[PDB]
Amino acid sequence: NASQQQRFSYNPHKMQFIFVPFLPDIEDKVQMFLTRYYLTNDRVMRNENSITPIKNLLGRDAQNFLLLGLLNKNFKGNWSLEDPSGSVEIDISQTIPTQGHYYVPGCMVLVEGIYYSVGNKFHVTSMT
Amino acid sequence: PITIRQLEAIIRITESLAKLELSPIAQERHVDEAIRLFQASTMDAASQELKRRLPIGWSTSYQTLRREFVDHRFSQLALDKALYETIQLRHQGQNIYRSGV
Amino acid sequence: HEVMEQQTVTIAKAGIHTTLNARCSVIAAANPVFGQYDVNRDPHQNIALPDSLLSRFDLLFVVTDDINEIRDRSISEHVLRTHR
Incomplete structure:
Protein backbone atom coordinates (compact mmCIF):
# COMPACT_ATOMS: atom_id res chain seq x y z
CA ASN A 1 0.00 0.00 0.00
CA ALA A 2 1.63 3.23 -1.17
CA SER A 3 -0.36 5.33 1.28
CA GLN A 4 0.48 2.94 4.11
CA GLN A 5 4.13 2.27 3.43
CA GLN A 6 7.02 3.08 5.77
CA ARG A 7 9.68 5.70 5.34
CA PHE A 8 13.46 5.38 5.56
CA SER A 9 15.94 8.22 5.35
CA TYR A 10 19.48 8.02 4.08
CA ASN A 11 22.35 9.46 6.06
CA PRO A 12 25.55 10.25 4.13
CA HIS A 13 27.53 10.18 7.34
CA LYS A 14 26.41 6.75 8.58
CA MET A 15 25.50 5.31 5.14
CA GLN A 16 22.43 3.72 6.66
CA PHE A 17 18.68 4.22 7.12
CA ILE A 18 16.68 5.19 10.22
CA PHE A 19 13.23 4.39 11.72
CA VAL A 20 11.49 7.47 10.29
CA PRO A 21 7.85 7.12 11.32
CA PHE A 22 -1.87 16.00 6.74
CA LEU A 23 0.24 17.78 4.10
CA PRO A 24 4.05 17.56 4.04
CA ASP A 25 6.59 20.22 5.03
CA ILE A 26 9.06 22.45 3.27
CA GLU A 27 12.07 20.76 4.87
CA ASP A 28 10.90 17.61 3.17
CA LYS A 29 10.88 19.36 -0.23
CA VAL A 30 14.41 20.53 0.36
CA GLN A 31 15.68 17.10 1.55
CA MET A 32 13.94 15.49 -1.51
CA PHE A 33 16.60 16.16 -4.12
CA LEU A 34 19.30 15.75 -1.53
CA THR A 35 18.32 12.12 -0.91
CA ARG A 36 18.44 11.22 -4.63
CA TYR A 37 21.95 12.56 -5.10
CA TYR A 38 23.23 10.83 -1.98
CA MET A 45 31.21 4.40 -4.53
CA ARG A 46 30.26 0.77 -5.12
CA ASN A 47 31.51 1.06 -8.75
CA GLU A 48 34.88 2.39 -7.46
CA ASN A 49 38.81 9.17 -12.66
CA SER A 50 37.62 10.34 -9.25
CA ILE A 51 34.92 12.22 -7.26
CA THR A 52 35.03 16.00 -6.68
CA PRO A 53 32.28 18.61 -6.24
CA ILE A 54 31.60 21.63 -8.46
CA LYS A 55 32.86 24.37 -6.07
CA ASN A 56 36.30 22.76 -5.94
CA LEU A 57 36.72 23.07 -9.71
CA LEU A 58 35.34 26.56 -9.89
CA GLY A 59 37.59 27.25 -6.90
CA ARG A 60 40.45 26.37 -9.18
CA ASP A 61 41.13 27.90 -12.54
CA ALA A 62 43.14 25.36 -14.49
CA GLN A 63 43.09 21.68 -15.24
CA ASN A 64 39.96 17.90 -16.23
CA PHE A 65 37.20 16.05 -14.46
CA LEU A 66 34.14 13.83 -15.01
CA LEU A 67 31.65 15.77 -12.95
CA LEU A 68 28.36 14.30 -11.61
CA GLY A 69 25.18 16.39 -11.52
CA LEU A 70 21.66 17.33 -12.65
CA LEU A 71 21.23 18.83 -16.15
CA ASN A 72 19.07 21.78 -15.32
CA LYS A 73 18.70 25.01 -17.20
CA ASN A 74 18.31 28.55 -15.82
CA PHE A 75 18.58 30.89 -18.80
CA LYS A 76 18.89 30.77 -22.61
CA GLY A 77 22.06 28.85 -23.38
CA ASN A 78 22.58 28.58 -19.60
CA TRP A 79 22.49 24.76 -19.19
CA SER A 80 23.45 24.40 -15.53
CA LEU A 81 24.63 21.37 -13.58
CA GLU A 82 23.95 20.95 -9.90
CA ASP A 83 25.40 19.06 -6.93
CA PRO A 84 25.01 20.12 -3.23
CA SER A 85 27.91 22.59 -3.46
CA GLY A 86 27.32 25.01 -6.31
CA SER A 87 26.27 25.51 -9.92
CA VAL A 88 28.14 25.67 -13.21
CA GLU A 89 27.18 26.48 -16.76
CA ILE A 90 27.68 23.64 -19.17
CA ASP A 91 28.24 23.74 -22.91
CA ILE A 92 27.99 21.08 -25.58
CA SER A 93 29.92 23.00 -28.24
CA GLN A 94 31.03 20.38 -30.79
CA THR A 95 30.45 17.37 -28.57
CA ILE A 96 30.26 13.77 -29.79
CA PRO A 97 28.72 11.96 -26.80
CA THR A 98 27.86 8.31 -26.54
CA GLN A 99 24.76 6.64 -27.92
CA GLY A 100 23.13 6.73 -24.53
CA HIS A 101 19.78 5.43 -23.40
CA TYR A 102 17.99 8.80 -23.27
CA TYR A 103 19.84 12.00 -22.36
CA VAL A 104 17.08 14.14 -20.84
CA PRO A 105 17.04 17.15 -18.55
CA GLY A 106 16.26 16.49 -14.92
CA CYS A 107 18.66 13.52 -15.08
CA MET A 108 21.87 12.92 -13.10
CA VAL A 109 24.59 12.36 -15.75
CA LEU A 110 28.37 12.33 -16.18
CA VAL A 111 30.31 14.68 -18.45
CA GLU A 112 34.06 15.03 -18.91
CA GLY A 113 35.89 18.21 -19.87
CA ILE A 114 37.64 21.32 -18.55
CA TYR A 115 36.46 24.31 -16.48
CA TYR A 116 38.31 27.25 -18.12
CA SER A 117 37.14 29.97 -15.69
CA VAL A 118 38.18 32.70 -18.20
CA GLY A 119 34.73 32.53 -19.74
CA ASN A 120 33.55 30.40 -16.83
CA LYS A 121 32.04 27.84 -19.22
CA PHE A 122 32.54 24.16 -18.38
CA HIS A 123 33.06 22.13 -21.56
CA VAL A 124 31.78 18.64 -22.41
CA THR A 125 33.79 15.94 -24.14
CA SER A 126 31.07 13.29 -24.04
CA MET A 127 27.82 12.89 -22.22
CA THR A 128 27.40 9.48 -20.67
CA PRO B 1 38.36 44.61 2.66
CA ILE B 2 39.15 40.93 2.35
CA THR B 3 42.56 39.59 3.29
CA ILE B 4 43.70 36.19 4.26
CA ARG B 5 43.14 37.34 7.86
CA GLN B 6 39.46 36.99 7.05
CA LEU B 7 40.11 33.28 6.35
CA GLU B 8 41.95 33.26 9.62
CA ALA B 9 38.85 34.53 11.32
CA ILE B 10 36.58 31.93 9.65
CA ILE B 11 38.81 29.07 10.59
CA ARG B 12 38.95 29.79 14.33
CA ILE B 13 35.25 29.72 15.02
CA THR B 14 35.32 26.07 14.05
CA GLU B 15 37.52 25.19 16.91
CA SER B 16 35.53 27.35 19.29
CA LEU B 17 32.39 25.33 18.76
CA ALA B 18 34.64 22.29 18.82
CA LYS B 19 35.83 23.38 22.25
CA LEU B 20 32.19 23.23 23.24
CA GLU B 21 31.94 19.69 21.93
CA LEU B 22 35.21 18.88 23.77
CA SER B 23 36.19 16.49 20.86
CA PRO B 24 39.73 16.53 19.47
CA ILE B 25 38.96 16.52 15.79
CA ALA B 26 36.91 18.71 13.49
CA GLN B 27 34.16 17.65 11.17
CA GLU B 28 32.57 18.70 7.91
CA ARG B 29 29.18 19.56 9.30
CA HIS B 30 30.68 20.95 12.47
CA VAL B 31 32.71 23.54 10.52
CA ASP B 32 30.34 24.63 7.78
CA GLU B 33 27.99 26.44 10.30
CA ALA B 34 30.65 29.10 10.58
CA ILE B 35 30.28 29.95 6.89
CA ARG B 36 26.74 31.18 7.61
CA LEU B 37 27.85 33.26 10.55
CA PHE B 38 30.76 34.88 8.75
CA GLN B 39 28.94 35.42 5.52
CA ALA B 40 26.33 37.28 7.52
CA SER B 41 28.99 39.56 8.85
CA THR B 42 30.65 40.51 5.56
CA MET B 43 27.95 40.68 2.93
CA ASP B 44 26.66 43.68 4.84
CA ALA B 45 30.19 45.04 4.48
CA ALA B 46 30.38 44.62 0.71
CA SER B 47 26.78 45.57 -0.03
CA GLN B 48 20.06 47.73 -26.04
CA GLU B 49 16.53 49.08 -25.47
CA LEU B 50 17.00 49.98 -21.77
CA LYS B 51 20.51 51.42 -22.24
CA ARG B 52 19.71 53.76 -25.16
CA ARG B 53 16.15 54.42 -23.95
CA LEU B 54 16.33 55.09 -20.19
CA PRO B 55 19.85 55.32 -18.66
CA ILE B 56 18.32 55.65 -15.18
CA GLY B 57 16.11 52.72 -16.26
CA TRP B 58 13.14 53.65 -14.05
CA SER B 59 9.58 53.62 -15.48
CA THR B 60 10.69 51.98 -18.76
CA SER B 61 9.92 48.41 -17.63
CA TYR B 62 7.27 45.80 -18.63
CA GLN B 63 4.36 48.23 -18.63
CA THR B 64 6.24 50.80 -20.71
CA LEU B 65 8.39 48.13 -22.39
CA ARG B 66 5.23 46.19 -23.30
CA ARG B 67 3.78 49.45 -24.61
CA GLU B 68 6.88 50.43 -26.64
CA PHE B 69 7.28 46.96 -28.16
CA VAL B 70 3.48 46.75 -28.65
CA ASP B 71 3.47 50.04 -30.58
CA HIS B 72 5.79 42.07 -32.49
CA ARG B 73 7.51 39.07 -30.95
CA PHE B 74 7.01 40.05 -27.30
CA SER B 75 4.75 37.81 -25.21
CA GLN B 76 4.22 38.40 -21.46
CA LEU B 77 5.46 34.89 -20.76
CA ALA B 78 8.28 35.43 -23.27
CA LEU B 79 8.90 38.80 -21.60
CA ASP B 80 9.53 37.23 -18.18
CA LYS B 81 11.56 34.44 -19.81
CA ALA B 82 13.88 36.29 -22.24
CA LEU B 83 14.15 39.21 -19.85
CA TYR B 84 15.23 37.15 -16.82
CA GLU B 85 24.91 41.86 -18.20
CA THR B 86 22.58 44.80 -17.82
CA ILE B 87 22.61 45.32 -14.05
CA GLN B 88 19.76 47.77 -14.57
CA LEU B 89 17.38 44.85 -14.93
CA ARG B 90 18.68 43.39 -11.64
CA HIS B 91 18.15 46.70 -9.82
CA GLN B 92 14.79 47.23 -11.53
CA GLY B 93 13.77 43.77 -10.35
CA GLN B 94 14.70 44.80 -6.83
CA ASN B 95 12.61 47.99 -7.10
CA ILE B 96 10.47 48.49 -10.27
CA TYR B 97 8.84 45.03 -9.88
CA ARG B 98 6.46 45.91 -7.06
CA SER B 99 6.45 49.46 -8.37
CA GLY B 100 4.34 48.10 -11.26
CA VAL B 101 6.23 49.84 -14.07
CA HIS C 1 68.92 60.86 9.94
CA GLU C 2 72.05 61.15 12.11
CA VAL C 3 71.98 57.52 13.18
CA MET C 4 71.46 56.27 9.66
CA GLU C 5 74.05 58.45 7.99
CA GLN C 6 77.04 59.25 10.19
CA GLN C 7 76.95 55.95 12.18
CA THR C 8 77.52 57.93 15.38
CA VAL C 9 75.51 59.22 18.29
CA THR C 10 76.48 62.44 20.07
CA ILE C 11 74.73 62.95 23.36
CA ALA C 12 75.06 66.44 24.79
CA LYS C 13 73.05 66.79 27.94
CA ALA C 14 74.00 68.94 30.90
CA GLY C 15 76.21 66.24 32.32
CA ILE C 16 78.87 65.44 29.70
CA HIS C 17 78.78 65.80 25.93
CA THR C 18 80.14 62.57 24.37
CA THR C 19 80.51 60.85 20.96
CA LEU C 20 80.36 57.07 20.25
CA ASN C 21 79.83 54.42 17.51
CA ALA C 22 76.90 52.24 16.38
CA ARG C 23 76.83 50.83 12.80
CA CYS C 24 73.55 48.91 13.02
CA SER C 25 71.35 47.44 10.28
CA VAL C 26 67.76 48.75 10.30
CA ILE C 27 64.48 47.37 8.94
CA ALA C 28 61.23 49.32 9.10
CA ALA C 29 57.64 48.61 8.03
CA ALA C 30 55.05 51.26 7.26
CA ASN C 31 51.56 51.55 5.77
CA PRO C 32 50.44 53.88 2.97
CA VAL C 33 48.87 57.20 4.05
CA PHE C 34 45.24 56.20 3.61
CA GLY C 35 43.78 52.97 2.42
CA GLN C 36 45.24 50.79 -0.28
CA TYR C 37 45.94 53.59 -2.80
CA ASP C 38 49.54 52.67 -3.32
CA VAL C 39 49.75 53.01 -7.13
CA ASN C 40 46.54 54.89 -7.78
CA ARG C 41 47.38 58.49 -6.84
CA ASP C 42 51.08 59.14 -7.64
CA PRO C 43 54.31 57.21 -6.93
CA HIS C 44 55.49 60.11 -4.87
CA GLN C 45 54.40 60.69 -1.26
CA ASN C 46 52.10 57.73 -0.75
CA ILE C 47 53.80 57.64 2.66
CA ALA C 48 54.26 61.34 3.57
CA LEU C 49 57.78 60.91 4.89
CA PRO C 50 60.60 63.49 4.77
CA ASP C 51 62.43 63.72 1.46
CA SER C 52 65.88 62.94 2.84
CA LEU C 53 64.64 59.64 4.23
CA LEU C 54 64.05 58.49 0.64
CA SER C 55 67.71 58.78 -0.14
CA ARG C 56 68.64 57.48 3.33
CA PHE C 57 66.97 54.08 2.85
CA ASP C 58 68.37 51.57 0.41
CA LEU C 59 65.38 49.54 -0.78
CA LEU C 60 61.74 50.58 -0.91
CA PHE C 61 59.30 47.80 -1.56
CA VAL C 62 55.83 48.49 -2.85
CA VAL C 63 53.60 45.51 -2.22
CA THR C 64 50.26 45.12 -3.92
CA ASP C 65 47.35 42.77 -3.13
CA ASP C 66 46.75 41.68 -6.69
CA ILE C 67 43.71 39.37 -6.88
CA ASN C 68 43.95 36.36 -9.23
CA GLU C 69 43.14 32.71 -9.03
CA ILE C 70 46.27 30.58 -9.43
CA ARG C 71 47.70 32.74 -6.71
CA ASP C 72 44.47 32.45 -4.74
CA ARG C 73 44.53 28.70 -4.76
CA SER C 74 48.22 28.58 -3.92
CA ILE C 75 47.68 30.90 -0.96
CA SER C 76 44.85 28.69 0.11
CA GLU C 77 46.79 25.42 0.14
CA HIS C 78 49.83 27.07 1.68
CA VAL C 79 48.01 28.52 4.67
CA LEU C 80 45.70 25.55 4.93
CA ARG C 81 48.35 22.88 5.03
CA THR C 82 50.23 25.31 7.26
CA HIS C 83 47.68 24.69 9.92
CA ARG C 84 48.42 21.00 9.77
Whole structure:
Protein backbone atom coordinates (compact mmCIF):
# COMPACT_ATOMS: atom_id res chain seq x y z
CA ASN A 1 0.00 0.00 0.00
CA ALA A 2 1.63 3.23 -1.17
CA SER A 3 -0.36 5.33 1.28
CA GLN A 4 0.48 2.94 4.11
CA GLN A 5 4.13 2.27 3.43
CA GLN A 6 7.02 3.08 5.77
CA ARG A 7 9.68 5.70 5.34
CA PHE A 8 13.46 5.38 5.56
CA SER A 9 15.94 8.22 5.35
CA TYR A 10 19.48 8.02 4.08
CA ASN A 11 22.35 9.46 6.06
CA PRO A 12 25.55 10.25 4.13
CA HIS A 13 27.53 10.18 7.34
CA LYS A 14 26.41 6.75 8.58
CA MET A 15 25.50 5.31 5.14
CA GLN A 16 22.43 3.72 6.66
CA PHE A 17 18.68 4.22 7.12
CA ILE A 18 16.68 5.19 10.22
CA PHE A 19 13.23 4.39 11.72
CA VAL A 20 11.49 7.47 10.29
CA PRO A 21 7.85 7.12 11.32
CA PHE A 22 -1.87 16.00 6.74
CA LEU A 23 0.24 17.78 4.10
CA PRO A 24 4.05 17.56 4.04
CA ASP A 25 6.59 20.22 5.03
CA ILE A 26 9.06 22.45 3.27
CA GLU A 27 12.07 20.76 4.87
CA ASP A 28 10.90 17.61 3.17
CA LYS A 29 10.88 19.36 -0.23
CA VAL A 30 14.41 20.53 0.36
CA GLN A 31 15.68 17.10 1.55
CA MET A 32 13.94 15.49 -1.51
CA PHE A 33 16.60 16.16 -4.12
CA LEU A 34 19.30 15.75 -1.53
CA THR A 35 18.32 12.12 -0.91
CA ARG A 36 18.44 11.22 -4.63
CA TYR A 37 21.95 12.56 -5.10
CA TYR A 38 23.23 10.83 -1.98
CA LEU A 39 21.68 7.48 -2.99
CA THR A 40 23.35 7.83 -6.38
CA ASN A 41 26.51 8.85 -4.49
CA ASP A 42 26.67 5.54 -2.60
CA ARG A 43 25.93 3.77 -5.91
CA VAL A 44 28.97 5.46 -7.42
CA MET A 45 31.21 4.40 -4.53
CA ARG A 46 30.26 0.77 -5.12
CA ASN A 47 31.51 1.06 -8.75
CA GLU A 48 34.88 2.39 -7.46
CA ASN A 49 38.81 9.17 -12.66
CA SER A 50 37.62 10.34 -9.25
CA ILE A 51 34.92 12.22 -7.26
CA THR A 52 35.03 16.00 -6.68
CA PRO A 53 32.28 18.61 -6.24
CA ILE A 54 31.60 21.63 -8.46
CA LYS A 55 32.86 24.37 -6.07
CA ASN A 56 36.30 22.76 -5.94
CA LEU A 57 36.72 23.07 -9.71
CA LEU A 58 35.34 26.56 -9.89
CA GLY A 59 37.59 27.25 -6.90
CA ARG A 60 40.45 26.37 -9.18
CA ASP A 61 41.13 27.90 -12.54
CA ALA A 62 43.14 25.36 -14.49
CA GLN A 63 43.09 21.68 -15.24
CA ASN A 64 39.96 17.90 -16.23
CA PHE A 65 37.20 16.05 -14.46
CA LEU A 66 34.14 13.83 -15.01
CA LEU A 67 31.65 15.77 -12.95
CA LEU A 68 28.36 14.30 -11.61
CA GLY A 69 25.18 16.39 -11.52
CA LEU A 70 21.66 17.33 -12.65
CA LEU A 71 21.23 18.83 -16.15
CA ASN A 72 19.07 21.78 -15.32
CA LYS A 73 18.70 25.01 -17.20
CA ASN A 74 18.31 28.55 -15.82
CA PHE A 75 18.58 30.89 -18.80
CA LYS A 76 18.89 30.77 -22.61
CA GLY A 77 22.06 28.85 -23.38
CA ASN A 78 22.58 28.58 -19.60
CA TRP A 79 22.49 24.76 -19.19
CA SER A 80 23.45 24.40 -15.53
CA LEU A 81 24.63 21.37 -13.58
CA GLU A 82 23.95 20.95 -9.90
CA ASP A 83 25.40 19.06 -6.93
CA PRO A 84 25.01 20.12 -3.23
CA SER A 85 27.91 22.59 -3.46
CA GLY A 86 27.32 25.01 -6.31
CA SER A 87 26.27 25.51 -9.92
CA VAL A 88 28.14 25.67 -13.21
CA GLU A 89 27.18 26.48 -16.76
CA ILE A 90 27.68 23.64 -19.17
CA ASP A 91 28.24 23.74 -22.91
CA ILE A 92 27.99 21.08 -25.58
CA SER A 93 29.92 23.00 -28.24
CA GLN A 94 31.03 20.38 -30.79
CA THR A 95 30.45 17.37 -28.57
CA ILE A 96 30.26 13.77 -29.79
CA PRO A 97 28.72 11.96 -26.80
CA THR A 98 27.86 8.31 -26.54
CA GLN A 99 24.76 6.64 -27.92
CA GLY A 100 23.13 6.73 -24.53
CA HIS A 101 19.78 5.43 -23.40
CA TYR A 102 17.99 8.80 -23.27
CA TYR A 103 19.84 12.00 -22.36
CA VAL A 104 17.08 14.14 -20.84
CA PRO A 105 17.04 17.15 -18.55
CA GLY A 106 16.26 16.49 -14.92
CA CYS A 107 18.66 13.52 -15.08
CA MET A 108 21.87 12.92 -13.10
CA VAL A 109 24.59 12.36 -15.75
CA LEU A 110 28.37 12.33 -16.18
CA VAL A 111 30.31 14.68 -18.45
CA GLU A 112 34.06 15.03 -18.91
CA GLY A 113 35.89 18.21 -19.87
CA ILE A 114 37.64 21.32 -18.55
CA TYR A 115 36.46 24.31 -16.48
CA TYR A 116 38.31 27.25 -18.12
CA SER A 117 37.14 29.97 -15.69
CA VAL A 118 38.18 32.70 -18.20
CA GLY A 119 34.73 32.53 -19.74
CA ASN A 120 33.55 30.40 -16.83
CA LYS A 121 32.04 27.84 -19.22
CA PHE A 122 32.54 24.16 -18.38
CA HIS A 123 33.06 22.13 -21.56
CA VAL A 124 31.78 18.64 -22.41
CA THR A 125 33.79 15.94 -24.14
CA SER A 126 31.07 13.29 -24.04
CA MET A 127 27.82 12.89 -22.22
CA THR A 128 27.40 9.48 -20.67
CA PRO B 1 38.36 44.61 2.66
CA ILE B 2 39.15 40.93 2.35
CA THR B 3 42.56 39.59 3.29
CA ILE B 4 43.70 36.19 4.26
CA ARG B 5 43.14 37.34 7.86
CA GLN B 6 39.46 36.99 7.05
CA LEU B 7 40.11 33.28 6.35
CA GLU B 8 41.95 33.26 9.62
CA ALA B 9 38.85 34.53 11.32
CA ILE B 10 36.58 31.93 9.65
CA ILE B 11 38.81 29.07 10.59
CA ARG B 12 38.95 29.79 14.33
CA ILE B 13 35.25 29.72 15.02
CA THR B 14 35.32 26.07 14.05
CA GLU B 15 37.52 25.19 16.91
CA SER B 16 35.53 27.35 19.29
CA LEU B 17 32.39 25.33 18.76
CA ALA B 18 34.64 22.29 18.82
CA LYS B 19 35.83 23.38 22.25
CA LEU B 20 32.19 23.23 23.24
CA GLU B 21 31.94 19.69 21.93
CA LEU B 22 35.21 18.88 23.77
CA SER B 23 36.19 16.49 20.86
CA PRO B 24 39.73 16.53 19.47
CA ILE B 25 38.96 16.52 15.79
CA ALA B 26 36.91 18.71 13.49
CA GLN B 27 34.16 17.65 11.17
CA GLU B 28 32.57 18.70 7.91
CA ARG B 29 29.18 19.56 9.30
CA HIS B 30 30.68 20.95 12.47
CA VAL B 31 32.71 23.54 10.52
CA ASP B 32 30.34 24.63 7.78
CA GLU B 33 27.99 26.44 10.30
CA ALA B 34 30.65 29.10 10.58
CA ILE B 35 30.28 29.95 6.89
CA ARG B 36 26.74 31.18 7.61
CA LEU B 37 27.85 33.26 10.55
CA PHE B 38 30.76 34.88 8.75
CA GLN B 39 28.94 35.42 5.52
CA ALA B 40 26.33 37.28 7.52
CA SER B 41 28.99 39.56 8.85
CA THR B 42 30.65 40.51 5.56
CA MET B 43 27.95 40.68 2.93
CA ASP B 44 26.66 43.68 4.84
CA ALA B 45 30.19 45.04 4.48
CA ALA B 46 30.38 44.62 0.71
CA SER B 47 26.78 45.57 -0.03
CA GLN B 48 20.06 47.73 -26.04
CA GLU B 49 16.53 49.08 -25.47
CA LEU B 50 17.00 49.98 -21.77
CA LYS B 51 20.51 51.42 -22.24
CA ARG B 52 19.71 53.76 -25.16
CA ARG B 53 16.15 54.42 -23.95
CA LEU B 54 16.33 55.09 -20.19
CA PRO B 55 19.85 55.32 -18.66
CA ILE B 56 18.32 55.65 -15.18
CA GLY B 57 16.11 52.72 -16.26
CA TRP B 58 13.14 53.65 -14.05
CA SER B 59 9.58 53.62 -15.48
CA THR B 60 10.69 51.98 -18.76
CA SER B 61 9.92 48.41 -17.63
CA TYR B 62 7.27 45.80 -18.63
CA GLN B 63 4.36 48.23 -18.63
CA THR B 64 6.24 50.80 -20.71
CA LEU B 65 8.39 48.13 -22.39
CA ARG B 66 5.23 46.19 -23.30
CA ARG B 67 3.78 49.45 -24.61
CA GLU B 68 6.88 50.43 -26.64
CA PHE B 69 7.28 46.96 -28.16
CA VAL B 70 3.48 46.75 -28.65
CA ASP B 71 3.47 50.04 -30.58
CA HIS B 72 5.79 42.07 -32.49
CA ARG B 73 7.51 39.07 -30.95
CA PHE B 74 7.01 40.05 -27.30
CA SER B 75 4.75 37.81 -25.21
CA GLN B 76 4.22 38.40 -21.46
CA LEU B 77 5.46 34.89 -20.76
CA ALA B 78 8.28 35.43 -23.27
CA LEU B 79 8.90 38.80 -21.60
CA ASP B 80 9.53 37.23 -18.18
CA LYS B 81 11.56 34.44 -19.81
CA ALA B 82 13.88 36.29 -22.24
CA LEU B 83 14.15 39.21 -19.85
CA TYR B 84 15.23 37.15 -16.82
CA GLU B 85 24.91 41.86 -18.20
CA THR B 86 22.58 44.80 -17.82
CA ILE B 87 22.61 45.32 -14.05
CA GLN B 88 19.76 47.77 -14.57
CA LEU B 89 17.38 44.85 -14.93
CA ARG B 90 18.68 43.39 -11.64
CA HIS B 91 18.15 46.70 -9.82
CA GLN B 92 14.79 47.23 -11.53
CA GLY B 93 13.77 43.77 -10.35
CA GLN B 94 14.70 44.80 -6.83
CA ASN B 95 12.61 47.99 -7.10
CA ILE B 96 10.47 48.49 -10.27
CA TYR B 97 8.84 45.03 -9.88
CA ARG B 98 6.46 45.91 -7.06
CA SER B 99 6.45 49.46 -8.37
CA GLY B 100 4.34 48.10 -11.26
CA VAL B 101 6.23 49.84 -14.07
CA HIS C 1 68.92 60.86 9.94
CA GLU C 2 72.05 61.15 12.11
CA VAL C 3 71.98 57.52 13.18
CA MET C 4 71.46 56.27 9.66
CA GLU C 5 74.05 58.45 7.99
CA GLN C 6 77.04 59.25 10.19
CA GLN C 7 76.95 55.95 12.18
CA THR C 8 77.52 57.93 15.38
CA VAL C 9 75.51 59.22 18.29
CA THR C 10 76.48 62.44 20.07
CA ILE C 11 74.73 62.95 23.36
CA ALA C 12 75.06 66.44 24.79
CA LYS C 13 73.05 66.79 27.94
CA ALA C 14 74.00 68.94 30.90
CA GLY C 15 76.21 66.24 32.32
CA ILE C 16 78.87 65.44 29.70
CA HIS C 17 78.78 65.80 25.93
CA THR C 18 80.14 62.57 24.37
CA THR C 19 80.51 60.85 20.96
CA LEU C 20 80.36 57.07 20.25
CA ASN C 21 79.83 54.42 17.51
CA ALA C 22 76.90 52.24 16.38
CA ARG C 23 76.83 50.83 12.80
CA CYS C 24 73.55 48.91 13.02
CA SER C 25 71.35 47.44 10.28
CA VAL C 26 67.76 48.75 10.30
CA ILE C 27 64.48 47.37 8.94
CA ALA C 28 61.23 49.32 9.10
CA ALA C 29 57.64 48.61 8.03
CA ALA C 30 55.05 51.26 7.26
CA ASN C 31 51.56 51.55 5.77
CA PRO C 32 50.44 53.88 2.97
CA VAL C 33 48.87 57.20 4.05
CA PHE C 34 45.24 56.20 3.61
CA GLY C 35 43.78 52.97 2.42
CA GLN C 36 45.24 50.79 -0.28
CA TYR C 37 45.94 53.59 -2.80
CA ASP C 38 49.54 52.67 -3.32
CA VAL C 39 49.75 53.01 -7.13
CA ASN C 40 46.54 54.89 -7.78
CA ARG C 41 47.38 58.49 -6.84
CA ASP C 42 51.08 59.14 -7.64
CA PRO C 43 54.31 57.21 -6.93
CA HIS C 44 55.49 60.11 -4.87
CA GLN C 45 54.40 60.69 -1.26
CA ASN C 46 52.10 57.73 -0.75
CA ILE C 47 53.80 57.64 2.66
CA ALA C 48 54.26 61.34 3.57
CA LEU C 49 57.78 60.91 4.89
CA PRO C 50 60.60 63.49 4.77
CA ASP C 51 62.43 63.72 1.46
CA SER C 52 65.88 62.94 2.84
CA LEU C 53 64.64 59.64 4.23
CA LEU C 54 64.05 58.49 0.64
CA SER C 55 67.71 58.78 -0.14
CA ARG C 56 68.64 57.48 3.33
CA PHE C 57 66.97 54.08 2.85
CA ASP C 58 68.37 51.57 0.41
CA LEU C 59 65.38 49.54 -0.78
CA LEU C 60 61.74 50.58 -0.91
CA PHE C 61 59.30 47.80 -1.56
CA VAL C 62 55.83 48.49 -2.85
CA VAL C 63 53.60 45.51 -2.22
CA THR C 64 50.26 45.12 -3.92
CA ASP C 65 47.35 42.77 -3.13
CA ASP C 66 46.75 41.68 -6.69
CA ILE C 67 43.71 39.37 -6.88
CA ASN C 68 43.95 36.36 -9.23
CA GLU C 69 43.14 32.71 -9.03
CA ILE C 70 46.27 30.58 -9.43
CA ARG C 71 47.70 32.74 -6.71
CA ASP C 72 44.47 32.45 -4.74
CA ARG C 73 44.53 28.70 -4.76
CA SER C 74 48.22 28.58 -3.92
CA ILE C 75 47.68 30.90 -0.96
CA SER C 76 44.85 28.69 0.11
CA GLU C 77 46.79 25.42 0.14
CA HIS C 78 49.83 27.07 1.68
CA VAL C 79 48.01 28.52 4.67
CA LEU C 80 45.70 25.55 4.93
CA ARG C 81 48.35 22.88 5.03
CA THR C 82 50.23 25.31 7.26
CA HIS C 83 47.68 24.69 9.92
CA ARG C 84 48.42 21.00 9.77
